[PDB]
């Protein structure tokens, strides 16, 4: 079953499994293999893999990582994906001295929003967008990956898992314990990632949920009933929250031009209902001139 695949090297570790680079000996194709151990005696096929596979087969799109094959054994389960060369996080760290050129930021953000709109249009939440899970190839593509935490949703949504999204990229409606959340939580993640491409450091590196809220508030202002009808009702809202003034957005991500600031500001709108959709984002004037440069690996 794997007779044809030739291991090249470990690439790392998922929400589970180990990931390897391999070549198809017969076709020459380069792939990534996610290897999951199962057992019997235990809990069977992990719900992460069940979701990742089922959703990943429906989501076929140029900015979503391609699941090529699924190999069964009694004991082993292999997910075969197209190989991509590195992740955004690795890339940004390599772009230390030079910064990432704005046309490339724009390209990458355009494509991520494309792929994210596609997820959202097929009732899928990613729920874990961050540079580690955004993969880039040597031809200008960037692609959503790691659907380990993804989930199929319904209209209107019901309460889904709370322990969700990596801290630094977590939307405030989740931090505040709101019983519903939706697509808006993924856009906030992009928002944060967009700011991170520009400034190269993370927009809200909190080390707890409270520290993370406070960082959001000190940048965006403490929300109240006028900015966000309903906040003072939410489960983890506290009337003793310090009330910080909103900072002028030019200060938040200084290198951004007016269009960029506009976009970023809507991607980080507190009220999810008014926050921008990936669909709507693709028509934003920020993108009027977008192209597709190849980066420098």
């Amino acid at each position: 079953s794997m007779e044809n695949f030739q291991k090249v090297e470990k690439i790392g570790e998922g929400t589970y499994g180990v990931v390897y680079k391999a070549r198809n000996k017969l076709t020459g194709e380069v792939v990534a293999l996610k290897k999951i151990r199962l057992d019997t005696e235990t809990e069977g096929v992990p719900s992460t893999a069940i979701r990742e596979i089922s959703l990943l087969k429906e989501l076929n799109h140029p900015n979503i990582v391609k699941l090529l094959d699924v190999i069964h054994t009694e004991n082993k389960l292999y997910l075969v994906f197209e190989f991509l060369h590195q992740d955004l996080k690795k890339f940004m760290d390599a772009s230390a001295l030079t910064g990432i050129p704005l046309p490339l930021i724009k390209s990458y953000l355009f494509q991520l929003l494309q792929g994210l709109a596609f997820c959202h249009s097929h009732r899928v939440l990613h729920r874990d967008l961050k540079p580690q899970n955004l993969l880039i190839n040597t031809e200008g593509a960037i692609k959503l990956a790691d659907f380990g935490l993804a989930r199929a949703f319904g209209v209107p949504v019901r309460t889904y898992t709370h322990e969700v999204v990596t801290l630094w990229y977590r939307a405030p409606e989740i931090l505040l314990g709101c019983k519903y959340y939706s697509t808006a939580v993924d856009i906030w993640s992009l928002g944060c990632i967009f700011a991170e491409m520009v400034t190269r450091r993370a927009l809200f590196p909190g080390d707890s949920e409270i520290d993370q809220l406070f960082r959001i508030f000190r940048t965006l202002g403490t929300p109240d009933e006028v900015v966000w009808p309903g906040v003072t009702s939410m489960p983890d809202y506290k009337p003793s929250f310090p009330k910080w003034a909103r900072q002028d957005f030019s200060k938040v991500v200084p290198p951004l031009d007016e269009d960029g600031r506009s976009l970023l500001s809507q991607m980080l709108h507190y009220d999810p209902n008014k926050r921008i959709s990936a669909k709507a984002a693709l028509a934003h004037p920020f993108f009027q001139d977008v192209t597709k440069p190849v980066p420098h690996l």
Binding site: S121, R123, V155, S182, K279
Partner: peptide
Amino acid sequence: VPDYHEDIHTYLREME
């Protein structure tokens, strides 16, 4: 949140 309601409805209709 209606930005996707129609797209999703369409999709489920194909998929069913």
